[PDB]
Every structure is written in structure tokens, then in C-alpha cells.
Amino acid sequence: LTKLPILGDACSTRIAYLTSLLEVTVANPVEGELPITVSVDVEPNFVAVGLYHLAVGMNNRAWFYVLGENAVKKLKDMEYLGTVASICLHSDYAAALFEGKVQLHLIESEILDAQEERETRLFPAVDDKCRILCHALTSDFLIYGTDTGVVQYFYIEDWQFVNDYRHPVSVKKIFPDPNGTRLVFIDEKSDGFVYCPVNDATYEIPDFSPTIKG
């Protein structure tokens, strides 16, 4: 094939790689399952994946889908206020990233005694001066990065902040561990670190390649 841009994502042990211009494949070989497809309606740009959902959007949109055990249902067609950068679906909640903002919204929502405090929230806080460069979602946390170097964990379940680190420079990429507690982030100068919020301290990763990507 002439060209196939390389997109895809990971959650636990569930690959969701791109197949072709109009397709995706979802599989969990680690737990012995089969490959499926979701034949996405457009040319996708980002492909998040998670326990129970896929997601593809190209310009300002995001077609969530439900990763069942049989088939996929075009859950919704929710949209965003800017160029959607890289959404990340783990568990139930989702967190799009459009124009230096991050907008935690519940996915499978029908207004059944669900507090509107929980439906939608927009980080960075309405008033502050940041641009969330990188966020990454865990079992229950909205770890994101900033420009003034603020790595705020955000416990979704009780809907409050739990951690405020402060890196000397703009944390610009983050990758949490599967368990969620510890973290790996890269600052501007390509200087990795391992932030472990429990004991609030960063350990430097020796001999870090200058062009690490992931």
C-alpha cells in the first residue's frame, strides 16, 4: 500500500492498531482473543483505546465506539471546541486535548441522577495561565503536564486534586505505569525522570537518549 500513517494505542494488554484507510483492528492476544474491526467512518487521526471503548476523530470530532465482546456500536459523535490533539480513554471517563486545554467528560452518559458536577470539567482551571501539553489517564487519575511544570494528579472518583508537583521546566510528555502511581515524564531538554508521588521526589534516568519519543 502506498502509505499508511502509523497510529494506535494501548490499554492494559489490548492493542488497537490501524489497518487501512477505512479500518481499525482491536485485539487482546495476551488474554487470547480475536481481531475485530471498526471500519471508522473517516480518515482517522487519533486512535485511543481503553478497557471498553475505542475512539477516532480527525479534525474537531471524535467517534467513540463501544468495544464489546461481539460488535461495536457508534456510541456518540461528540465534538470539541478546537483541533483535537490526543484523547485518552481508559475506564469510563474520557479526556480530550484541544488547544492547550483538557476536558474531562463522561462517555456513556444519560441524564439519570448523574450530578452535572461530574459530566464535564475543563482543565487547566478557568482562571490560571497554562497550556496542558500532555495528559495521560489511568485507572482513576487525570495526570497532565503544563508549561509552568505542574504535574497535577486528579482523583476522578472524589473529584479533587491529590498531588501538585512543580518541575523546573514544562513537562511535555507523560507516561504513567500500569498501576498508575508512578510516572515517567520528559521535560523540554529531553531529560527523563521518574516521579513517584508517594514520596514526592524525582529520580533522573541515566543515559537518556536525546530523542526519546515514547
Binding site for other proteins (CB under 8 A): 140, 153, 155, 157-163, 179-181, 197-199
Judged by beta carbon, residue 110 or residue 157, the one nearer other proteins is 157
CB of 184 to other proteins, least distance (A): 16
Judged by beta carbon, residue 158 or residue 207, the one nearer other proteins is 158
Judged by beta carbon, residue 16 or residue 156, the one nearer other proteins is 156
Distance of CA 37 to the CA centre of its chain: 21
CB of 53 to other proteins, least distance (A): 23
Overall residue count recorded for the chain in this entry: 214
SS3 118: helix
CB of 135 to other proteins, least distance (A): 17
CB atoms within 10 A of CB 103: 19
Judged by beta carbon, residue 79 or residue 164, the one nearer other proteins is 164
CB of 12 to other proteins, least distance (A): 15
Separation of alpha carbons 1 and 34, rounded Å: 24
Contact of 198 with 181, CB cutoff 8 Å: yes
Separation of alpha carbons 62 and 204, rounded Å: 37
